Ligand binder design. Structure first.
Ligand SMILES: N#Cc1c(NC(=O)c2cc(S(=O)(=O)N3CCOCC3)c(Cl)cc2Cl)sc2c1CCN(Cc1ccc(-c3nn[nH]n3)cc1)C2
Length: 454
């Protein structure tokens, strides 16, 4: 991260006199104080708590400077109207400074996303960096940019949306050289009206691109009204310019042929969508001087990530939302908010299962308690709590919810009511229910999610 204090202040329109402080070359930028090391930039954001509360901890951990919306006594600080806007301005600047080629991709559906496939193909030739996990939003994307290893030649940025316009912002921020749009399987759509509005939002990905730049978009007509006018658009799907003409899905792998490729590709995954993802990633990689042979060998060893978190089904028909990514309090708040904003299926309830977050140190109990502000008796019919640090939150919810709408199960260094928790979830979960599970990744949460799926 080639950045100094005065340079950031310049870039973000610092409102304080920065010359008071040394112009130190910075190390990395973090919004999670646990990740701060010597020489870092702290970025205090509105999370489950406002990151301003953790500025002192950041400096104890070695931060050299912090962005801030208020004066910070006894520490170097960069005073701005809004930290996140500053963060985003900084990432956009960093892209201008490094002039890295940016590849923007939407839509993350399973265990081998277009973002991961594309980065993997570009890596054959180029120092390539990419969005890690699900860091694809107004916070994750700027973080990704600022974490790009010095010398990177190609940067693959996934861009997600929760509300229409989210992708416009990210595209205008990143100014992609090239973009890919894929459509997924909504199930239920949270803050989006219908499939058209979904497609509208995804096609904003081309908003920040220069005329004549390449955009891959599906053949599906839902995107038609939203096609850019001044980009080079290439469609993919049955009948379109890019097309899969043959496909064998085996045991645990798949072989397929794309019209524009000389030979079949082999992938060590299953599913239609993956062949499509492979195909469109391949096309772009070809445009970047990667050979078909390089692409074929590359796919012989492709990474599977965690299943990019979404909905599953229990074997009784219920809708499971298991959120494995990001075991931190803000991610807990946020998934609570998202899950809560989904309407319940006709005939069904909404159940949340919450377990202890880990590595919150001395602050663990209070940060769990903080989730009370994200729990609403109106939308959540049953909240079930599992762990030890989460006990006080369970108590708070039991006071704030109707009689009988909360359950707590103990998990300590000795006692463990996992067995009871499982029974209770099974008894409470109807065929038309929605159930959210969120905690750290434990063997038990994993055993639970599995007793439902089975
Ligand atoms: N709120 C909050 C906290 C965090 N929030 C995040 O990591 C975070 C996580 C997310 S996110 O949802 O995970 N996100 C990632 C980016 O892509 C989008 C999805 C987002 Cl959008 C935003 C934030 Cl700000 S991480 C974290 C917190 C609270 C405190 N933490 C550890 C800690 C422990 C002890 C002390 C302490 N205080 N006094 N003595 N010790 C201070 C901090 C770690």
């Amino acid at each position: 991260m080639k950045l100094t204090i005065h340079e950031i202040a310049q870039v973000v329109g610092a409102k304080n006199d920065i010359s008071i402080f040394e112009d130190t070359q910075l190390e990395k930028a973090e919004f999670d104080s646990r990740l701060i090391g010597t020489g870092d930039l702290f970025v205090p954001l509105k999370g489950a708590r406002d990151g301003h509360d953790f500025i002192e901890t950041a400096f104890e951990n070695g931060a050299a400077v912090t962005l801030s919306e208020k004066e910070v006594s006894n520490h170097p600080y960069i005073l701005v109207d809004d930290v996140l806007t500053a963060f985003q301005s900084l990432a956009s600047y960093y892209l201008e400074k490094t002039t890295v080629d940016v590849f923007a991709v939407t839509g993350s559906n399973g265990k081998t996303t277009t973002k991961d496939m594309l980065a993997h193909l570009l890596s054959t030739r180029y120092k390539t960096y990419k969005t890690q996990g699900n860091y694809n939003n107004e916070i994750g994307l700027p973080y990704t940019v600022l974490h790009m290893p010095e010398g990177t030649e190609k940067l693959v940025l996934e861009m997600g949306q929760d509300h229409l316009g989210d992708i416009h912002l990210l595209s205008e921020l990143a100014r992609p050289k090239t973009a890919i749009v894929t459509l997924v399987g909504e199930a239920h759509l949270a803050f989006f009206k219908d499939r058209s509005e979904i497609a509208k939002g995804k096609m904003q990905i081309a908003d920040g691109m220069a005329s004549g730049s390449l955009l891959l978009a599906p053949a599906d007509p839902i995107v038609e009204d939203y096609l850019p006018i001044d980009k080079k658009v290439v469609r993919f799907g049955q009948g379109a310019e890019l097309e899969i003409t043959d496909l064998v899905e085996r045991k645990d792998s798949l072989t397929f042929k794309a019209n524009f490729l000389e030979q079949a590709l082999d992938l060590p995954v299953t599913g239609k969508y993956n062949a499509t993802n492979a195909m469109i990633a391949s096309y772009v990689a070809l445009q970047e001087g990667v050979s078909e042979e390089q692409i074929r060998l590359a796919f012989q060893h492709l990474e599977l990530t965690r299943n990019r978190t979404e909905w599953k089904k229990a074997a009784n028909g219920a809708d499971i939302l298991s959120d494995v990514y990001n075991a931190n309090p803000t991610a807990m708040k946020l998934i609570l908010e998202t899950f809560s904003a989904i309407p319940a299926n006709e005939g069904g309830k909404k159940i949340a299962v919450l377990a202890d977050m880990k590595e919150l140190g001395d602050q663990s109990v209070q940060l769990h308690n903080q989730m009370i502000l994200s729990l609403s008796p109106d939308v959540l019919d049953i909240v079930i709590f599992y762990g030890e640090d989460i006990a006080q939150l369970a108590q708070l919810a039991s006071q704030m919810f109707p009689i009988g709408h909360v359950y707590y199960f103990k998990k300590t260094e000795d006692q463990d009511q996992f067995e009871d928790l499982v029974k209770q979830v099974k008894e409470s979960l109807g065929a038309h229910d929605q159930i959210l599970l969120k905690g750290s990744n434990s063997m038990n949460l994993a055993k639970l999610v599995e007793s439902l799926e089975n």
